[PDB]
């Protein structure tokens, strides 16, 4: 007998996409080969993002992509996102962008192309930059989800600002005892 | 079954040492406590204001806030299987500077200066402190004296 613990032997991580999308599986095959047969760590990151779930591949708005592309030294670089690129109607000027995405919204696609931009899929990105040279790997806001407002410390604990689960919002719904000093306590 | 009183079981802990009662010496009030320095929480019983709780006596923390008479200390407390950093206000009577941090700062000043001097004259010197090494070989001289022969003594009944 040996003195070890076996509760952490099996690392919990995606070794493949749980999706049955045959097109996603094809470009997983392409980037499984690229990650193995190159020393590019860019291919390793892209490959493991391809396995990720939809909640782990948040959409990237056009405004956020433009703002990251506008940073110094990123001219003539390809914006790579492993997910959906989304139109942001809050912006009025779209510059010229070279973009690779898993998926682009129709309105966002029209805006990028009309501004002289270029849109690539991940198969075309492999031919353009097999090692991912001259690319900016972007990601949508991972915690930009309603669930994360409810996560954290319990709402009925001091110094916790987490949203409780309520069927309705109003003066009659969970605004009394434990929420104000007049009604017992507040914390 | 035990009471939850704040000072239960502090009969001897907060009592003064023998023949050291009375007026608190004033050097304990003249000590300077900056932010980020390490202080030991004693908890003398002569001053009843700003006393630490019994679970912080003999604990060491880091000062994060300084007031007119007290300091704010971040001190680790273990509650069941979790250690969480408590923040407590303690009057300066119940704290004193920790010499563990003072000795290490002295060593850093020696280390940094010793490195500087070594570069100026050239050769390499040891900075890290090593654990007590095994004793080296040596000669023990008899000096013309035969070592005294010891013998266990017979037993006889004391009292």
């Amino acid at each position: 007998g040996v003195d070890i613990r076996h509760n952490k032997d099996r690392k919990v991580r995606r070794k493949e996409p749980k999706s049955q999308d045959i097109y996603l599986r094809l470009l997983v095959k392409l980037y499984r080969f690229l990650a193995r047969r190159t020393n590019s760590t860019f291919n390793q990151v892209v490959l493991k993002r391809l396995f990720m779930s939809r909640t782990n591949r948040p959409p990237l708005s056009l405004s956020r992509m433009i703002r990251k592309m506008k940073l110094p030294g990123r001219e003539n670089k390809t914006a790579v996102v492993v997910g959906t690129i989304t139109d942001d109607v809050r912006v009025q000027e779209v510059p010229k962008l070279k973009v690779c995405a898993l998926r682009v919204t129709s309105r966002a696609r029209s805006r990028i192309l009309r501004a002289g931009g270029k849109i690539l899929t991940f198969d075309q990105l492999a031919l353009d930059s097999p090692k991912g040279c001259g690319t900016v790997l972007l990601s949508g806001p991972r915690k930009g989800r309603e669930v994360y407002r409810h996560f954290g410390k319990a709402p009925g604990t001091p110094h916790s600002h987490t949203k409780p689960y309520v069927r309705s919002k109003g003066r009659k719904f969970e605004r009394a005892r434990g929420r104000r000093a007049s009604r017992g306590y507040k914390n | 079954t035990n009471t939850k009183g704040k000072r239960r079981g502090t009969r001897y802990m907060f009592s003064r040492p023998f023949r050291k009662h009375g007026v608190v010496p004033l050097a304990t009030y003249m000590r300077i406590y900056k932010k980020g320095d390490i202080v030991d929480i004693k908890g003398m019983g002569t001053v009843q204001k700003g006393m630490p709780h019994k679970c912080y006596h003999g604990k060491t923390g880091r000062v994060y806030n300084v007031t007119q008479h007290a300091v704010g200390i971040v001190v680790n407390k273990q509650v069941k299987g979790k250690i969480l950093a408590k923040r407590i206000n303690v009057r300066i009577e119940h704290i004193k500077h920790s010499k563990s941090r003072d000795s290490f700062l002295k060593r850093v000043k020696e280390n940094d200066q010793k490195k500087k001097e070594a570069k100026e004259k050239g050769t390499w010197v040891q900075l890290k402190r090593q654990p007590a090494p095994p004793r080296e070989a040596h000669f023990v001289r008899t000096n013309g004296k035969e070592p005294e022969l010891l013998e266990p003594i017979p037993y006889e009944f004391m009292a």
């Binding site: 409810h150 319990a154 689960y165 309520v166 069927r167 | -």
Partner: protein
């Protein structure tokens, strides 16, 4: 019993609901029947507008 975080739910199923349940399996048949009546009414008022006044 409550279990961890959740929404305080108040279902209105304390009133013997299973004896008053309205299924909609006749919805496709109802749409057909009204459409026959619409077509029959339009034929009856032959030149008059089908929708009415």
């Amino acid at each position: 019993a409550p279990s961890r975080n959740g929404m305080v739910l108040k279902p209105h199923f304390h009133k013997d609901w299973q004896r008053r349940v309205a299924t909609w399996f006749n919805q496709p048949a109802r749409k057909i029947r009204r459409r026959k009546a619409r077509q029959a009414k339009a034929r009856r008022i032959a030149p008059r507008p089908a929708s009415g006044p």
